[PDB]
Design a protein around this nucleic acid. Structure first.
Ligand SMILES: [Mg+2]
Ligand SMILES: [Mg+2]
Ligand SMILES: [Mg+2]
Ligand SMILES: [Mg+2]
Ligand SMILES: [Mg+2]
Ligand SMILES: [Mg+2]
Ligand SMILES: [Zn+2]
Lengths: 127, 96, 60, 114, 154, 82, 202
RNA sequence: GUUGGGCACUCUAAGUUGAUAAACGAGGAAGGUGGGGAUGACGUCAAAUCAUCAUGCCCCUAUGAUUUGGGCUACACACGUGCUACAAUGGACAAUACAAAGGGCAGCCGCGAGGUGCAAAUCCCAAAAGUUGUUCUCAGUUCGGAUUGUAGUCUGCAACUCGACUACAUGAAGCUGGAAUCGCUAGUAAUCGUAGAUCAGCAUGCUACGGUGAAUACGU
RNA sequence: AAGAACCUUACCAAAUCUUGACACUAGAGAUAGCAGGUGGU
């Protein structure tokens, strides 16, 4: 009696299982607050329970890897929204309107030859 | 347990060879399907011009594709796979 | 490269540290790859002919 | 107060104040306060007379202040007297450790003379 | 740009005060992408505000921002041999930008040792209609009303 | 600095020149190209005409020079100006 | 300015001319390959060789020679290919097997058309006439397009220039288009003349 | 997850899909050539390269060749490109998290630099910024680490000219920079680390990789 | 120039060679008992 969802953000992948519960989140066998540095990250990933009106209704077990704490926190949010589609496909309308079903396609841009970075050009001097 | 590793620069010739080993083993006896190992990509960044213009480069790659085949419960198979000759670009390591 | 320079690099040196690499095609002492033993210029020409196995232009 | 002939700052912790002695840096100050059993966090105006005496006895075993200045000056004088490469750079006011002098030798040379 | 206007990015409300304006403030405070430091400064400054004033920090912060936000600005213009500072009305979204930018910029120039101290005092000052950020707004209106004759340019 | 476990480096040809004069009084100048040789204690009292790139310049060895390279007393660049 | 048409398509729609795999002997095998390719170019310079393919497996080298005139490479009774195979086994100390593949319609092969132009230019032929004749021949044989270019001191002029001709379509930006390309050099009394030929078959 | 067991989930990599008379909300991961790369028309600069290579003409058979040593690293200055700083959004100390991309065969006890299983999804090279606490308290200082002295480590036949790193000591200018000038529109700028080529040793350069991560665009 | 201590390396000094580098003792070592040219345009 659990629902699964895979969330991705940057280079992070979260495997999210929803079990009925009081609203706890565990990330790699650690409390989400002992795993993530900011409370603003915790509010970001609890967005799917807000727009769906299911706060304190499920427990979240997360297996996450790759990226940093922000990419992981937002991969968990993507995974929770995907897992909520399994619990009730009627959540899709509210989740889609909030933008929580989109896989954020923003990834690190490759460095280009001749430039100092993806876009940063060297200092120019016409002399 | 026979462990077979295929390496090639072209993925099309490595799927052709991987299938051939898999049929040959099953035409002899139990084969674990071709496991695609990660591709190795080596990149070479050279200056395009011969004398100056450092900021203009050209990039080249060499990709090494890899396959893993496991054969269990062979003794016609060991001779059957050994008799096979694969395309020239494929090198095979049989850890029989 | 000068013919004597190419010949001198092919000789056995008095010390192992004196050994250095030249492009085996043209004798260039700079920008010689170890995997191919070609300078950056010859590597480009031969890769364009498809004569270096597996090597093609890279984009990602 | 006065430790090696120098009046170290009174308001600071001992580890810091000891570094105001020529010849004592951060690591030496730490080992001096381990040898002479004085806590590093004590302000030197709060050092007891016994604690101050133990510091002065450990410090007495280190080459500091004018004894260290004489030794360093004798070393540079020897290099110049034998006219070594470094001794010549010392007299000429130029970098002695192989640094380039085409640019960026201002510390040894001084302000630019355009 | 030449083509036209570009869509703007929304932000989330902050977890403590449920305020989007507070989130935008943290971004102005933040340097080099170091968000945790910026959040720490902002929430520490708001604790200082709440106890040095006796009121809610957010309520004081909305008062302070209203005293910094300008209603009129000046725009440069070239008019046939005489640069004219044309007075224009600041759009509501630019008002918030300038309010937050001036608050942070003039909190950075103050003499208190820590930024949480500097930001809290700027907020307390701007909520009393004083301080550097309120003065900067006053000088912007003083530059605008001195040119209200030039309102006919565009 | 050279590793202590390897000892002080001196060219063998130069050292034999110094030892060949050991047990004499009319010491003679030793011409050498070995700028990289450490000055040993038995170099004291000897003169070494050391190549600086174009000529051999005399280097008379006193005790305070022991442990330095012979090249440190034969400067190779000429500068007297701007 | 314009990328080599072959190099852009290598490994995309064009196959490698070297078909072997190695890791630690890559450099040694690569230069044995180049040693062979230089030997074949010199020893068969009059045999209209378009290109050479090298395959390696089990201390054996399989060399395929695509030639306009296969009877010269093989020789009367296979004698000329036996002599070349014996000399290759001395440059290599490996077991070389040589295959010969005739290429009909030598007027649609960029390398053969480029070298024919270079040979005629060395005989003081008109740098215009040789380009136009080559283009007319290829298009009569159903080529979708052809482009030719001769660069250098054309006709012994003191100032070098490039004269180029074209017919049909030669879509050098279309990646899937199989465009045959070759460059050849004519040794004239006035120096180097560069011949470039682009052929698009379809 | 070090294995018994499974191929569920993740991943790997082959195939297959993956949504504008012109043009100017729904559904969907993605909406308008989705982001980025490769690809650079006819021509201009007699632009660069005879020193990658090749080559006409000029040009000696010493302007050819070998070695040891020196120089290419000089130093009154001037310019370009960068790195580190001027500190409290910080320094020092302690504890504790989270990457990606690559490379590897004779290759991957000492305070310290260092010394004495794996030919690869297997083993090794091998995160920091961050978070949580303690301390420093606005001082050219517990910022800064230039310069110099001493003693070492490693490579190398050999670190004087002229290597890198370490320890102790020393502790310069520098407290946000005139006229002027540069980059960047989003996973960008900024900032933080990581890897590779060359390579015995030597990277603040180059190429590449991820982490944190903005502000603004009214308008021509 | 994607790797100047020697080598690279061309440049300088000295010591050496002239179908030529290429097609145990003495000495700093190299060494004794038609090609070439990183020369110019
Ligand atoms: Mg070397
Ligand atoms: Mg010109
Ligand atoms: Mg020449
Ligand atoms: Mg230089
Ligand atoms: Mg410090
Ligand atoms: Mg040299
Ligand atoms: Zn080359």
């Amino acid at each position: 009696v659990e629902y699964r969802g895979t969330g991705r953000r940057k280079n992070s992948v979260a495997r999210v299982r929803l079990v009925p519960g009081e609203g706890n989140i565990t990330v790699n066998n650690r409390d989400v607050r002992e795993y993530l540095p900011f409370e603003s990250l915790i509010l970001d990933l609890n967005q799917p329970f807000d727009v769906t009106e299911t706060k304190g209704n499920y427990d979240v077990l997360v297996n996450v890897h790759g990226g940093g704490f922000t990419g992981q926190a937002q991969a968990i949010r993507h995974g929770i929204a995907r897992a909520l589609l399994e619990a009730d496909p009627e959540y899709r309308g509210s989740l889609k309107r909030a933008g929580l079903l989109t896989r954020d396609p923003r990834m690190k841009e490759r460095k280009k030859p001749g430039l100092k970075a993806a876009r940063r050009s060297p200092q120019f001097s016409k002399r | 347990k026979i462990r077979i590793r295929l390496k090639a620069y072209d993925h099309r010739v490595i799927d052709q060879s991987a299938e051939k080993i898999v049929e040959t083993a099953k035409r002899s006896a139990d084969v674990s399907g071709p496991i695609p190992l990660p591709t190795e990509k080596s990149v070479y960044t050279i200056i395009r011009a011969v004398h100056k213009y450092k900021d203009s480069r050209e990039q080249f790659e060499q990709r090494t594709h890899k396959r893993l085949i496991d054969i269990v419960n062979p003794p016609k198979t060991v001779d059957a796979l050994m008799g096979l000759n694969l395309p020239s670009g494929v090198d095979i390591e049989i850890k029989l | 490269a000068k013919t004597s320079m190419v010949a001198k690099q092919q000789k056995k040196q008095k010390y192992a540290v004196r050994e250095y690499t030249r492009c085996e095609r043209c004798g260039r002492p700079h920008s010689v790859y170890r995997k191919f033993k070609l300078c950056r210029i010859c590597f480009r020409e031969l890769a364009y002919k498809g004569q270096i196995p597996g090597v093609r232009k890279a984009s990602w | 107060a006065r430790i090696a002939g120098v009046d170290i700052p009174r308001e600071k912790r001992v580890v810091i104040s000891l570094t105001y002695i020529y010849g004592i840096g951060t690591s030496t100050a730490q080992k001096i306060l381990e040898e002479a059993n004085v806590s590093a966090d004590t302000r030197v105006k709060d050092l007891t007379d016994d604690e101050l005496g133990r510091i002065r006895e450990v410090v007495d075993g280190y080459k500091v202040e004018g004894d260290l200045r004489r030794e360093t000056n004798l070393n540079i004088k020897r290099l110049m007297e034998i006219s070594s490469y470094r001794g010549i750079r010392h007299r000429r006011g130029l970098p002695v450790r192989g640094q380039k002098t085409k640019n960026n030798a201002r510390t040894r040379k001084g302000p630019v003379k355009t | 740009p030449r083509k036209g206007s570009v869509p703007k990015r929304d932000v989330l409300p902050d977890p403590i005060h449920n305020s989007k304006l507070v989130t935008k403030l943290i971004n102005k405070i933040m340097l080099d992408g170091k968000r945790g430091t910026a959040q720490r400064i902002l929430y520490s400054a708001f604790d200082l505000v709440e106890q040095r004033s006796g009121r809610d920090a957010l309520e004081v912060f909305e008062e302070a921002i209203n005293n910094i936000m300008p209603v009129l600005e000046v725009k440069a213009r070239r008019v046939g041999g005489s640069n004219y500072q044309v007075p224009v009305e600041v759009r509501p979204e630019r008002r918030t930008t300038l309010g937050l930018r001036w608050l942070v910029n003039y909190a950075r120039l103050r003499g208190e040792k820590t930024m949480e101290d500097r930001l809290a005092n700027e907020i307390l000052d701007a909520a009393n209609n004083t301080g550097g950020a309120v003065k900067k707004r006053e000088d912007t209106h003083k530059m605008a009303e001195a040119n209200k004759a030039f309102a006919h340019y565009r | 600095a050279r590793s202590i476990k390897k000892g002080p480096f001196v060219d063998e040809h130069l050292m034999k020149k110094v030892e060949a004069q050991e047990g004499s009084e009319k010491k003679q100048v030793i011409k050498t190209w070995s700028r990289r040789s450490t000055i040993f204690p038995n170099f004291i009292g000897h003169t070494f005409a050391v190549y600086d790139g174009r000529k051999h310049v005399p280097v008379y060895v006193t005790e305070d020079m022991v442990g330095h390279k012979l090249g440190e007393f034969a400067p190779t660049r000429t500068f007297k100006g701007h | 300015q314009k990328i080599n048409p072959i190099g852009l398509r290598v490994g995309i729609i064009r196959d490698w001319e070297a078909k072997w795999y190695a890791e630690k002997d890559f450099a040694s095998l690569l230069h044995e390959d180049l040693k062979i390719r230089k030997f074949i170019d010199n020893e068969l310079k009059e045999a209209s060789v378009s290109h050479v393919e090298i395959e390696r497996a089990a201390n054996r080298i399989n060399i395929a020679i695509h030639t306009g005139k296969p009877g010269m490479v093989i020789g009367k009774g296979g004698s000329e290919i036996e002599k070349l195979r014996n000399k290759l086994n001395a440059l290599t100390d490996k077991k070389v097997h040589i295959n010969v593949i005739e290429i009909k319609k030598v007027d649609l092969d960029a390398r053969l058309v480029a070298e024919n132009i270079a040979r005629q230019l060395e005989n003081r032929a008109s740098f215009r006439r040789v380009q136009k004749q080559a283009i007319t021949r290829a298009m009569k044989l159903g080529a979708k397009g052809i482009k030719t270019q001769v660069s250098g001191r054309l006709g012994g002029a003191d100032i070098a220039r490039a004269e180029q001709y074209s017919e049909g379509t030669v879509p050098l930006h279309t990646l899937r288009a199989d465009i045959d390309y070759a460059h050849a050099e004519a040794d004239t009394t006035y120096g180097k003349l560069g011949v470039k030929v682009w052929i698009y078959r379809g």
